Write a protein that binds this ligand. Structure first.
Ligand SMILES: CC1(C)CC(Nc2nc(-c3cccc(-c4ccccc4)c3)cs2)CC(C)(C)N1
Length: 519
């Protein structure tokens, strides 16, 4: 039960209207990218004979539901309003019920789908970029409107030598919407067909089994060849599409495989310790404070997750009652660099309180004591030299360098990654200059959007700055890997496209630098 089938990637506002009136009943719902606004998201629900279109906005921080609450993943929004029946109201006071997710048949958001592809090209990818169990679903060439499942069965590992590895093509005839292997069960979508034979593998005479283990891998590219990959993901034709949009929606369709328990944040005692009540840290990667023996009640909770591929800490904008716990986290984790990707107040709404003292001032935050030594005022950011110590104790003073990015737009992402790339280059060198410094504390508003976008860009650069330009990078796998440690890292497609532009702009400077060193 993942299932995210209730999300239709390529759907009109009128098609969703008809889809609920004919194939749905009262309570049936679906989520769709809003036509009206490229950042908006509409939740269409059949409500008393008619359809109600509730919209969800996402600027790069969270999914904000109108007349509802904010969430990290569009799936946890559905998980919330399906297990909480009386919270989605029209107000008027009439409740809107999410009871029956209406599934979709479009396979374009699946990793194993390939769109246009041919047998030789499909077989070439299965032996070059393949492995035992690798499978793909392409468009049929000869018989139109059908599909061809191409699965590789190998030597076990399947590399070196030849003769005992094999690629088996399978015909998938499509007739009156349904799909089949020319016999047996007829499925409603390629997913229902693929998911079925991933659990009931096809077997032919002489007893060979076509294990649909893992899909292929169009994603992992060499870091030097990114300027040609960004060129492919930029051509637009939506039979599809914007390459960034088709790739990102595939990454979104894998998000409910990361519905890990965040119950330590759902406790009543930690209710007001979260800036946003439904955006919570994973229990298995949360930062656990160690106040010690109470000192009632000590408490160990903070909305922060450890990010480890140099490690990171992705936290929230400090609340009034969490400034004390924040500086406890910086002390125990031995953190020395803080990345703040939000202004003190943006668009009139406060997203983070001032947790640092004014310049040349000393302030006590409970057990911790912070001195603001200096404030450097570059453009795009501000560096604050801070000394963190423990009140009533010696040999606890450490210098914490807070980097406060100030020029991130209120709506969307910047237009030039040079500011972020230069900002991260100074942040990385300051971090590496301190021996055995703790993880890098990155935060913003909710701590998933800009906070996740900054970290993923830094993770890809750390790989490139070390291993060089001839190394393999994989952005969706990098996004997904961080999303398994904090729910909803990298929010919007705009932030996702910016991560490609940042790595691209970073490779050019490296190549230009190397060439200039050769005059
Ligand atoms: C075939 C092609 C071009 C790429 C297909 N494959 C993709 N896979 C991903 C993806 C997303 C999250 C994680 C991973 C991943 C990669 C390697 C190992 C584990 C997970 C891949 C993004 S696009 C998807 C579509 C249908 C859009 N077309």
């Amino acid at each position: 039960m993942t299932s995210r089938r209730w999300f239709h990637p390529n759907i009109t506002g009128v098609e969703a209207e008809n889809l609920l009136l004919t194939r749905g009943v009262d309570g049936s719902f679906l989520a769709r990218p809003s036509k009206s606004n490229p950042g908006d998201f509409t939740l269409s629900v059949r409500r008393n004979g008619a359809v109600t279109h509730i919209k969800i906005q996402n600027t790069g921080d969270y999914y904000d539901l109108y007349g509802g609450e904010k969430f990290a993943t569009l799936a946890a929004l559905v998980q919330y309003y399906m297990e909480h029946h009386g919270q989605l109201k029209e107000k008027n006071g009439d409740v809107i019920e999410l009871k029956y997710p209406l599934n979709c048949a479009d396979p374009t958001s699946e990793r194993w789908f390939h769109g246009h592809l041919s047998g030789k090209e499909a077989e070439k990818l299965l032996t070059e970029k393949g492995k035992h169990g690798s499978f793909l679903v392409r468009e049929s060439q000869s018989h139109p409107g059908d599909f061809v499942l191409s699965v590789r069965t190998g030597d076990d590992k399947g590399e070196s030598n030849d003769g005992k590895s094999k690629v088996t093509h399978v015909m998938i005839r499509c007739q009156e919407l349904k799909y089949d292997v020319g016999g047996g069960e007829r499925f409603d979508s390629l997913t229902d067909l693929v998911e079925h034979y991933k659990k009931n593998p096809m077997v032919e005479t002489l007893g060979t089994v076509l294990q649909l283990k893992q899909p292929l891998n169009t994603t992992r590219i060499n870091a030097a060849e990114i300027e040609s990959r960004v060129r492919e993901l930029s051509k637009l034709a939506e039979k599809v599409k914007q390459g960034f949009w088709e790739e990102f929606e595939t990454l979104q369709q894998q998000e409910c495989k990361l519905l890990y328990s965040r119950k330590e944040g759902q406790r009543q005692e930690n209710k007001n310790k979260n800036r946003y009540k439904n955006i919570l840290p994973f229990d298995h990667t949360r930062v656990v404070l160690h106040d010690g023996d109470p000192n009632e009640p000590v408490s160990d909770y903070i909305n922060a997750n450890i990010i480890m591929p140099k490690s990171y800490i992705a936290t929230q904008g400090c609340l009034q009652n969490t400034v004390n716990d924040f500086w406890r986290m910086v002390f125990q984790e031995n953190s020395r660099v803080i990345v703040m990707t939000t202004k003190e107040v943006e668009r009139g709404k406060s997203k983070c309180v001032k947790y640092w003292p004014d310049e040349y001032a000393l302030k006590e935050y409970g057990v911790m004591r912070v001195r603001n030594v200096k404030e450097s005022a570059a453009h795009d950011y501000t560096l604050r030299e801070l000394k963190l110590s423990k009140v009533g104790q010696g040999n606890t003073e450490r210098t914490v360098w807070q980097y406060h990015f100030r020029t991130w737009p209120d709506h969307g992402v910047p237009s030039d990654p040079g500011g972020v790339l230069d900002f991260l280059e100074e942040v990385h060198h300051k971090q590496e200059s301190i021996m055995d410094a703790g993880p890098v504390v990155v935060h913003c508003s909710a701590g998933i959007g800009r906070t996740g976008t900054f970290i993923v860009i830094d993770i890809l650069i750390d790989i490139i700055r070390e291993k060089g330009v001839d190394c393999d990078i994989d952005v969706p796998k990098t996004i997904q890997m961080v999303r398994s440690q904090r729910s909803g890292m990298v929010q919007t497609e705009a932030q996702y496209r910016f991560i490609y532009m940042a790595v691209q702009h970073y490779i050019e400077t490296l190549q230009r630098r190397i060439e200039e060193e050769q005059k």
